[PDB]
Amino acid sequence: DFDPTEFKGPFPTIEICSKYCAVVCNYTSRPCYCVEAAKERDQWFPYCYD
């Protein structure tokens, strides 16, 4: 994984991360969605990502 916006890890700011998630894997110009890993909860890793 890598955090383009904050540090190195999952996204906090999932709103902007939904945009970033898009540019991350598939949706470079399309809306995208982040999935939240439940253990830490805040693990906003894009639906197609690490």
Close Cβ partners of 17 (under 8 Å, ≥ 6 residues apart): 5, 11, 34, 44, 46
Determination approach: NMR
Buried b (16+ CB within 10 A) or exposed e, 5-33: eeeeebbeebeebbebbbebeebeeeebe
CA 27 vs CA 7, 23, 31, 43, 49: distances in Å: 22, 6, 6, 20, 12
